[PDB]
Design a protein around this nucleic acid. Structure first.
Ligand code: K
Ligand code: K
Ligand code: K
Ligand code: K
Ligand code: K
Ligand code: K
Ligand code: MG
Ligand code: MG
Ligand code: MG
Ligand code: MG
Ligand code: MG
Ligand code: MG
Ligand code: MG
Ligand code: MG
Ligand code: MG
Ligand code: MG
Ligand code: MG
Ligand code: MG
Ligand code: MG
Ligand code: MG
Ligand code: MG
Ligand code: MG
Ligand code: MG
Ligand code: MG
Ligand code: MG
Ligand code: MG
Ligand code: MG
Ligand code: MG
Ligand code: MG
Ligand code: MG
Ligand code: MG
Ligand code: MG
Ligand code: MG
Ligand code: MG
Ligand code: MG
Ligand code: MG
Ligand code: MG
Ligand code: MG
Ligand code: MG
Lengths: 77, 164, 202, 240, 85
RNA sequence: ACGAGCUACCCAUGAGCAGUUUAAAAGAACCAACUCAUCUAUGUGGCAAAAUAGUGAGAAGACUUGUAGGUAGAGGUGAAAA
RNA sequence: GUUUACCAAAAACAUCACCUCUAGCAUUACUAGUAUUAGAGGCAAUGCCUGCCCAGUGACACCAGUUUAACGGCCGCGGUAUU
RNA sequence: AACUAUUCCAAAAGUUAAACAACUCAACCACAAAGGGAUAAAACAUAACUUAACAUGGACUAGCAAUUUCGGUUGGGGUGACC
RNA sequence: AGUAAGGUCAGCUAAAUAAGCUAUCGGGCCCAUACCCCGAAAAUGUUGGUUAUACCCUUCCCGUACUACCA
């Protein structure tokens, strides 16, 4: 079929990981220690951000099925 | 001498050949090169093949000789027909030439029932007879020899010792 | 990989010093290219018998492209390093001391493969009485199937054969592998006549 | 500076979508195609090329839809028609005499004998009669309609051999395609688009074509009436 | 990077010329790491692999000046730590 | 290296065209705002490194115009005047 | 309608029309299009017409060959009805 | 030259491989064929062909384009002539 | 003015082996003419030099042709 997305308009995929991460049993050297970008050092991989305390406005939108009134049957409004 | 037939003469000379029966008792003719060389063994084998492939004891052995009738100079020599009677004629014979001029001649030697010594003697006479057209030592005249009977295939005769 | 040399000479510097390089020393000329050479072959030791190559533990100078693509990655063969060769050479000594190789030569394995799927036509002429013996059967291999068979290798079913029919022949190579090939005894035909009647017509 | 293409919408919708003109400038910003720019502002309608598209995968059977209205599309030279069925609507290219309150059948079942060719039905090339006029040709199964979409252009099926159909494009070039591809029977609407006459230079500017350059170029060897044999048939069937 | 003479004649035009190696896409197997890496390799690299009689031998025997690749040095360091540890 | 705040063209986003004549908002007609600059006279270190006065052509369109963005010198742009 | 802002506003360029040429097709131009489409050009509405010529050159075919609404070309000497 | 396009060779990847023109003149054989009067060797020491997308080296054609110049004497230069 | 360039039967062409066609002259065929068939004659613009001549050069003569521009 003809999907309506366009490669340029869609969000780019993440850049390929550095070759150091592919070597088993080898700790990569990243610039996360100096908390700023530096050429020649591997790009760090960070775990998903987990705010200990939830904030109303700045939190991600909860999934629809998380709502208590969510039901499998499709009702038309 | 055309370069096309010079390639052919190079090709036939490059065909591998080995002496004696290999270690394997049973092997493919494709895998191993020719082995049968002796004239005395070849004549006996043809008589043996007559027993193995039961036919008439009398068979005309039409020998095929891959004669180098070319490459004397840069200009090739022309075919001819030298007639010399064999010491043991079968029951002066012309030496025919190939229609395609592919450097092979088919001339009858003798009957199968003739003894190997007489047939080998006839073979030696044929070798000297064919070389009479170009007896020069500048280039070789014989490349390969294949002795076949009426109901048998040719054998690669070790004709190099019999050239002189 | 290209190989080039400078057109203009470079002045010397013999005290272990880097020589002076000028613009005219950048002018190169291609003297030889490594990809246009007639490439050589790669020698490998086989760790498993191949259908058309040698047998388990054998030296073969296969084409360089083949070795890196299907032999080495799949484990059929290993690099023929000098240290690797003596491991197989010593390995051979153990089996051949007690006659336990049973692997055949490079051609010997191919002989078994061909004889596994083959049929021999034993053409006999009925105008004269014929009796089949191992010497006669080996003849038909050379002409029909192109197989050279030692007279002692063949083991006929010991039943004299005087009429056309279907039988079996036991073929043994190097006294290690025994192959039972089908035997088809049919009336003999001249190949010039036989090929005219069947091959040329169809 | 790199620009962003306006084709950012991801979900299909029948309503017209906003559209930005280019003017021949590529993403870099330089002119690549001359004589384009300064046209009347237009909105784009999302056109569903794939005729056979079930609402759900639960029932892959043939379905029949209803035509609501036939409108004028500024982008293409043909006329598009709104078609609704089930719980969705689609903009598809209308054939020569498609009108409001009409029913259109979409099917893919390749039957042995035949299927009657109607003016709006879309059927695979394997079930259509030999002498059928077609448009919206699908080059490969599931790829979608790419060929024969201009106003008044219709291709004619030629023959079906060894489970493969051969059609004639409007350029009088034979094309080979698998018989399972979906095609639409009939001729594309707005037949007299070729006979339309532009009354003044301004009407070209309204459409969006800028005037040609005034440089006088002497004709080379490329010009002159060229008689050339028809190129061989283009086949999209991959022979194993 | 360099120049050349057209027709290989000195009295001819001087021309800028760039010679590029022919690159190939291959995946290699290392016994020390037991992982397959899809690495852009050249025909000379494969010849050096055969000359050293092993991919791991090629990395561990060729020095830094011969390898001239940060991936190779990291590949050696990964295997060198594997042996010592 | 730096320049499309003037100018050539284009992409966005806005804003103007009163009266009069005609089934007409028709690249129709009369005539302002508005935009170009035909002819002549002053001016020629001038008010002005291209203007003033009179007179002219278009004035619902291929029209004028504000803001902001894009194309950069082996090029950009051009209803070719190099 | 447009052009040499600052010596030429024109008979120059553009233009509706006609004609030749090149292309069977997908994710940034052409185009979210598909030969009644889109580019590279010539000539200028309408009306009556657009004659002859592939030798050369160019293009196509990439071979014979085919093309001028492709670049271009489209004849002498002598005599002859009182003058 | 680069670059764009066309074509070939090399590199690279892959595919397949052990081969055909009698005729019995005599005559055996119930046939089907046979025997005497040929049934070789060989395929090529690898060979042959295909190869999408990218892409290297060396050539061919075309487009586009780069570098550099355009002699002298002359009753002023050009033109004719001369060296 | 300069430069270029040519002359051949009565006419037009090709060769310098001076030929071919037509015209002209004579004869045949027809009632006569023409067509047609047969036979004959015919020339290298001019002077000089080119072993000697001719295709060449030179002299004389006729006629043909291009150019004559920047201020
Ligand atoms: K339309
Ligand atoms: K800007
Ligand atoms: K002023
Ligand atoms: K004007
Ligand atoms: K031509
Ligand atoms: K003077
Ligand atoms: Mg010193
Ligand atoms: Mg459009
Ligand atoms: Mg135009
Ligand atoms: Mg023009
Ligand atoms: Mg601006
Ligand atoms: Mg008004
Ligand atoms: Mg008006
Ligand atoms: Mg004024
Ligand atoms: Mg005034
Ligand atoms: Mg006044
Ligand atoms: Mg006015
Ligand atoms: Mg007016
Ligand atoms: Mg800039
Ligand atoms: Mg330019
Ligand atoms: Mg303009
Ligand atoms: Mg001009
Ligand atoms: Mg000019
Ligand atoms: Mg005007
Ligand atoms: Mg001006
Ligand atoms: Mg202006
Ligand atoms: Mg003016
Ligand atoms: Mg017309
Ligand atoms: Mg006209
Ligand atoms: Mg004009
Ligand atoms: Mg005109
Ligand atoms: Mg004409
Ligand atoms: Mg021609
Ligand atoms: Mg190259
Ligand atoms: Mg220079
Ligand atoms: Mg000069
Ligand atoms: Mg001078
Ligand atoms: Mg003068
Ligand atoms: Mg001159």
């Amino acid at each position: 079929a003809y999907e309506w997305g366009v490669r340029s308009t869609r969000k780019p995929e993440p850049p390929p990981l550095d070759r150091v991460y592919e070597i088993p049993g080898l700790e990569p050297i990243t610039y996360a220690g100096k908390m700023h970008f530096m050429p020649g050092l591997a790009r760090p991989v960070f775990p998903p951000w987990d705010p200990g305390w939830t904030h109303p406005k700045f939190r991600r939108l909860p999934p629809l099925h998380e709502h208590p009134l969510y039901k499998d049957q499709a009702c038309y409004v | 001498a055309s370069d096309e037939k010079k390639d052919d003469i190079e090709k036939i000379k490059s065909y591998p050949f080995m002496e004696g029966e290999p270690e394997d008792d049973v092997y493919l003719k494709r895998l191993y090169p020719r082995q049968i060389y002796e004239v005395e063994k070849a004549i006996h084998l043809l008589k043996k093949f007559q027993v193995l492939d039961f036919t008439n004891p009398n068979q005309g052995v039409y020998l095929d000789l891959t004669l180098d009738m070319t490459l004397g100079k840069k200009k090739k020599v022309e075919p001819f027909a030298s007639v010399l009677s064999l010491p043991y004629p079968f029951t002066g014979h012309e030496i025919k030439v190939d229609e395609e001029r592919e450097n092979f001649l088919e001339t009858k030697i003798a009957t199968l029932n003739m003894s190997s010594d007489q047939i080998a003697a006839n073979l030696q006479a044929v070798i000297n007879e064919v070389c009479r057209q170009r007896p020069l030592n500048l280039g070789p005249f014989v490349v390969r020899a294949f002795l076949r009977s009426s109901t048998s295939e040719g054998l690669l005769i070790k004709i190099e010792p019999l050239l002189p | 990989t290209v190989i080039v040399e400078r057109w203009w000479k470079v002045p010397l510097a013999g005290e272990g010093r880097k020589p002076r390089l000028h613009r005219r020393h950048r002018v190169y000329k291609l003297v030889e290219d490594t990809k246009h050479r007639p490439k050589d072959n790669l020698e490998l030791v086989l760790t498993q018998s191949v259908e058309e190559l040698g047998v388990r533990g054998d030296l073969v100078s296969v084409k360089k492209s083949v070795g890196r693509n299907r032999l080495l990655p799949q484990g059929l063969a290993v690099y023929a390093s000098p240290e690797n060769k003596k491991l197989f050479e010593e390995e051979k000594l153990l089996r051949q001391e007690g006659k336990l190789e049973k692997l055949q030569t490079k051609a010997g394995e191919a002989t078994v493969k061909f004889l596994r799927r083959c049929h021999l036509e034993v053409g006999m002429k009925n105008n004269v009485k014929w009796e089949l013996n191992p010497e006669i059967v080996a003849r038909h291999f050379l002409r029909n199937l192109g197989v050279v068979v030692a007279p002692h290798a063949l083991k006929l079913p010991e039943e004299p054969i005087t009429q056309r029919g279907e039988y079996w022949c036991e073929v043994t190579v190097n006294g290690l592998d025994t192959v039972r090939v089908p035997m088809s005894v049919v009336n003999f035909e001249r190949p010039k006549t036989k090929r005219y009647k069947y091959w040329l017509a169809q | 500076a790199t620009s962003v293409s306006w084709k950012s919408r991801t979900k299909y919708t029948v309503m017209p979508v906003k559209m930005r003109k280019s003017g021949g400038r590529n993403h870099t910003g330089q002119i690549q195609v001359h004589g384009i720019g300064g046209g009347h502002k237009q909105r784009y309608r999302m056109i569903d090329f794939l005729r056979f598209r079930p609402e759900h995968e639960s029932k892959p059977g043939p379905f029949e839809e209803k035509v609501i209205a036939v409108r004028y599309d500024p982008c293409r030279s043909a006329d598009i028609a709104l078609v609704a069925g089930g719980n969705r609507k689609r903009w598809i290219i209308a054939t020569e005499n498609m009108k409001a309150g009409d029913t259109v059948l979409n099917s893919d079942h390749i039957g042995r004998m035949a299927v009657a060719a109607r003016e709006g039905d879309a059927h695979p090339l394997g079930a259509l009669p030999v002498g059928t006029l077609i448009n919206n040709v699908e080059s490969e199964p599931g790829r979608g309609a790419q060929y024969i979409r201009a106003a008044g252009t219709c291709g004619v099926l030629l023959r079906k051999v060894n489970g493969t159909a051969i059609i004639q494009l409007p350029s009088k070039r034979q094309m080979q395609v698998l018989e399972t591809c979906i095609a639409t029977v009939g001729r594309v609407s707005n037949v007299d688009h070729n006979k339309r006459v532009i009354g003044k230079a301004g009407r070209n500017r309204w459409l969006g074509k800028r005037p040609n350059s005034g440089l006088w170029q002497r004709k080379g060897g490329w010009a002159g009436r060229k008689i050339r044999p028809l190129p061989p048939m283009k086949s999209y069937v991959k022979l194993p | 990077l360099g120049h050349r003479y057209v027709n290989n004649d000195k009295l001819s035009k001087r021309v800028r010329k760039v010679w590029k190696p022919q690159l190939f896409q291959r995946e290699l197997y290392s016994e020390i790491l037991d992982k397959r890496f899809t690495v852009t390799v050249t025909m000379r690299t494969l010849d050096l692999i055969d000359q050293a009689c092993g991919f791991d031998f090629y990395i561990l025997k060729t020095p830094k000046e011969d390898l001239c690749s940060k991936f190779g040095m990291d590949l050696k360091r990964g295997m060198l730590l594997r042996l010592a540890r």
